[PDB]
Amino acid sequence: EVQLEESGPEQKKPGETVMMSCKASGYTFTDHSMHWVKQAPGKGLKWMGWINTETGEPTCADDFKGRFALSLETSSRTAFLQINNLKNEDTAIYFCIGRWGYYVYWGQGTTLVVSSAKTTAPSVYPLAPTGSSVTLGCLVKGYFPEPVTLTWNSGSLSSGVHTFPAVLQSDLYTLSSSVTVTSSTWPSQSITCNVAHPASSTKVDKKIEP
Amino acid sequence: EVQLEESGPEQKKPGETVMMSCKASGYTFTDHSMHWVKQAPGKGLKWMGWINTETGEPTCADDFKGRFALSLETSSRTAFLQINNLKNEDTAIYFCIGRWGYYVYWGQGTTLVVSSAKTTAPSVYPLAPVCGDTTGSSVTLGCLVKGYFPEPVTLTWNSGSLSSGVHTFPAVLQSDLYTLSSSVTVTSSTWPSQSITCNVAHPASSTKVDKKIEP
Amino acid sequence: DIQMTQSPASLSVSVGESVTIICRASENINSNLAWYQQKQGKPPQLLVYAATNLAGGVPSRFSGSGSGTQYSLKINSLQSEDFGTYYCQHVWGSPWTFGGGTKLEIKRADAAPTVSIFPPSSEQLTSGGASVVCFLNNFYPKDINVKWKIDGSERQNGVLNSWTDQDSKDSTYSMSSTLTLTKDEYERHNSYTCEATHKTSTSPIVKS
Amino acid sequence: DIQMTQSPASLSVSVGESVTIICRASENINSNLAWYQQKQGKPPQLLVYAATNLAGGVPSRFSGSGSGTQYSLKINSLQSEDFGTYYCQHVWGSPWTFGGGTKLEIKRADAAPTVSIFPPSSEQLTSGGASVVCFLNNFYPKDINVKWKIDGSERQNGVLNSWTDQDSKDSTYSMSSTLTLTKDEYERHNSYTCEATHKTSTSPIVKSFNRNEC
Amino acid sequence: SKKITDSNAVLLAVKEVEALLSSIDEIAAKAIGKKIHQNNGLDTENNHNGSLLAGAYAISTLIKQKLDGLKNEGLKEKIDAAKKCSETFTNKLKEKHTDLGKEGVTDADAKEAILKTNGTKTKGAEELGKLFESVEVLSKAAKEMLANSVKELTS
Amino acid sequence: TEISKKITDSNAVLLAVKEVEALLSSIDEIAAKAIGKKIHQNNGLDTENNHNGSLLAGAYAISTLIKQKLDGLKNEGLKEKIDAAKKCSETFTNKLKEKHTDLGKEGVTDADAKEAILKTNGTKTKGAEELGKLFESVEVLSKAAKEMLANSVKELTS
């Protein structure tokens, strides 16, 4: 088997440059190749290019070498993908793959978000409220970047949950989450919203009451 | 399949030098080699060496160099075995072999005789049955070819039409001259009633002889 | 180069039934093809490689078959966890181009969305803004369409919607609709409603 | 290098019975072994190659077996056409060394030799020489011993003898014993005898001619 | 000093095909009618050569893949002859599917398909032998392309 | 000309190694594409389960030859890494012999043949493990033989 570990997430605004890495270990790639894959939000998996692991020779698709540079270092077995003059369309999660025999080895992926936004803490808002079960919520709004950790009672209450994926506009994410519980529990037992946005060093535990 | 054809037979004397050839046709030898084999009379088959059919590089057993020399002409796919300062123990049949896949292709062999002998025609003597008792209804008749060099002579009976009842005996060498006999058995039904003749040919001396066998 | 094509584009098969996805290349690829499953927000997971070999941790109910130009991934029966978009990939030389993907969902009994509406929070309108959230949980089919009526009239210009993925256990969906607005306009109007039309009922579900 | 030893040295087996020869290499040769049959005065004929595969025209009663360093050739029902000397050969790289050979004779019932004597040809008498030749035809076993008496007393040099190989049809042997002598010497003594002894009979067969008789 | 190495590439690519072909020889000459034995390695197991025939087909498809990837204007006519020879071989085995497309393929059938030195070559072996020589012709021509240019060192 | 022959010596070592590499690549091919398969009139290969005996006999025979080629490979600089591959080879072939009870029958199951010669299979208990080490030990040898050649053709432009 073969392992491939890529860089952490990156946030840039249009115009600047990012360089992602992917370090392989274990067996030798059968055809001495490491390939890069682009996955834009809403679009499918798209092959970008490959680099020769013996000679470091880059080979890109016709859509991916005006602003794109593939490079390799051999002692550490890391491939490098650099994008210059970043555009919004560059916003994607990029994968780095290779094969031993005919088995393909993947992951973990690196997300790149190209946006004019700067790091902003969220503003977390409790959603207060027939039927012997009532639903409650949490409104996390106006933050950057992802991720935000949201739980209910330190994760001790995880049935009836629906946290929703964050969406971006005006360069700030908005996220919500809803809990549902029988009327015997609330407002008689302690609930709470735990949100954590480490980028802005924000930890906020907030309690929804009538 | 691969075909190997080798030189004609050779008769030399101690001291001279001989060169044999072997031409390959058909597929390529999968390991690009042609091996030479020697079989002295009374001994088994012994491997001599091989030559690379791409580079012409020879390789021989320790029993065979400082004397033996092996070359190859790539244009014609023809190997060559040349032996110098020949000795009596070089008398042998020399084969040339090679493989395609794991199948070995052979033949036909070159016969080398190193000897003080010279080309001598044979004399042929019809061996008639002894008068007196026609013991048994079967009469055996003989032909004796004597005093020739080199091998071979070819003997037939009535130009090959009489084939059953024949015993041609292996030629044996004595004092640089071969002797060979042949016996034909046939029932007194036939002899001396009809015509049976002994046909012998010796192309080395350009000899053609037919000798009828009469009482 | 070689181009990969998948079919069908989308597919709703209920649990227990068997399914077949098709990948067709534009040339012979001599069984140099892999299959992937990808859930929303997660990396693709290798299912099959060299057309007919199961990858690590793949159940025996998945199988790959095919030759030459056409190949197929088959799931015998189906389990609540096998939803997602499946891809094929030509794995030889370069490029290793992917197929367009087949979105497969578990078909399920139709469920009405349990709808909840929440006023703008007290902390929120001390900051100067207002946002009313409408939660639409545990429904099927996916396609639901929400709008909002205000003091008789209704509103559409500036609203944000987020949908969940198919739940791995009950195969339902959930959708959060939040309308954010300057407290200039919200404070005028006493009560608000949230409007959703779904095939579970001709009349739209409504909560005030 | 990798030496090849064959066993046994020789066998005498009847028609219809079985035969197995052994070839043992000094190291593992990876089934790169050929088998040959060679009849007297002819090139060797390939029987088996890569240890187990029959060559062109070889009947199915032949087979090859073995692995590593020990190999064998078998004839499950031996036909009379199968006499000869059998060789194995290592066929890979260099050298392609041979086994010592195994001589296979076809055992057979005993047969008395049909003996024939012939007078010196008249043209050979004009030569300077004279020949009384003794043909010993179709006898088994091969072992035969022949004498040559001249009016009673023997003669032991100037004799030259040759056997044929085993007959491909009935597995018997044949022998010629020839007597090409100065002519003056043939023109002195009366009776000439050429009488061999075989396992077939006690005492020798006696076939003989007379010069001035008839 | 890189057309010298550019034609190295085609020589190494042909050598690879030549090695893949040598493996079909090996299993034909030593694996047909055989099974794994602990002491002997391979022992007798007759008339079940279907899986071994499938491996031979799979090696042959791979060979055809390699030859199709060979592009060079110099040897292109000899590459195309090799390509056609390969495709004719593979098509012959599929033609003889009735005899080779089954688990219990007899030893005789198998040798007639992939043992190019067998006396009868009715089920593929004939086309295989021509495949070998086709690659041999290409190997010689590839070995002349580098050798004539490597002569630049001392000429 | 002192190097003219040492470049030729280095390249002979490479060619011998690449041959070994290609035969191993054929074991890879039959394990990934021929296990559980039969020849088909139109599709080339179709499904035919649990008779992999003759195929595995072929894998053993290809591995006999790999061992044979490596034993013939001799070079003083790469001695340690030749013998490393050799011992991997003998370890692979001995593993297949050891599992003769599951591999030495016409009816070798698909699952068991994958554990013997499919180096990427989830389970590798019958040869696949040792096969993978053989692959790696040869590419350590190949990566080095190439450096030996590269070190010689280097000597012409400095």
Author numbering:
A (entry chain A): 1 to 129, 135 to 215
B (entry chain H): 1 to 215
C (entry chain B): 1 to 208
D (entry chain L): 1 to 214
E (entry chain C): 46 to 200
F (entry chain D): 43 to 200
From the primary publication:
Outer surface protein C (OspC) plays a pivotal role in mediating tick-to-host transmission and infectivity of the Lyme disease spirochete, Borreliella burgdorferi. OspC is a helical-rich homodimer that interacts with tick salivary proteins, as well as components of the mammalian immune system. OspC consists of four long α-helices, two shorter α-helices (4 and 5), and two short antiparallel β-strands located between α1 and α2 (23, 24). The biologically functional molecule is a dimer (with monomers referred to here as OspC-OspC′) that assumes a knob-shaped structure anchored via an N-terminal lipidated moiety in the spirochete’s outer membrane.
To define B5’s epitope in greater detail, we solved the X-ray crystal structure of the B5 Fab fragment in complex with OspCA at a 2.7-Å resolution in the P21212 space group. The crystal structure revealed two B5 Fabs bound to a single OspCA homodimer (1:1 Fab:OspCA stoichiometry) in a side-on fashion. The interaction between B5 Fab and OspCA buried a total surface area of 2,040 Å2 (2,002 Å2 for the second B5-OspCA interface within the asymmetric unit) establishing 9 hydrogen bonds and 3 salt bridges (12 hydrogen bonds and 3 salt bridges for the second B5-OspCA interface within the asymmetric unit). Collectively, the B5 CDR H1, H2, and H3 elements contacted OspCA α-helix 1 and α-helix 6, along with the loop between α-helices 5 and 6 (loop 5-6). CDRs L1, L2, and L3 contacted OspCA α-helices 1 and 5, β-strands 1 and 2, and the loop region immediately N-terminal to α-helix 6. CDR L1 and L3 interacted with α-helix 2′, burying 364 Å2 and forming a single H-bond between CDR L1 Asn-30 and Gln-110 in OspCA. Second, the B5 Fab-OspCA structure reveals that B5’s epitope is quaternary, as the VH and VL elements span the OspC-OspC′ dimer interface. First, the structure reveals that B5 attacks the OspCA homodimer at a right angle, favoring an interaction with OspC’s stem (α-helices 1 and 6), rather than the more accessible head.
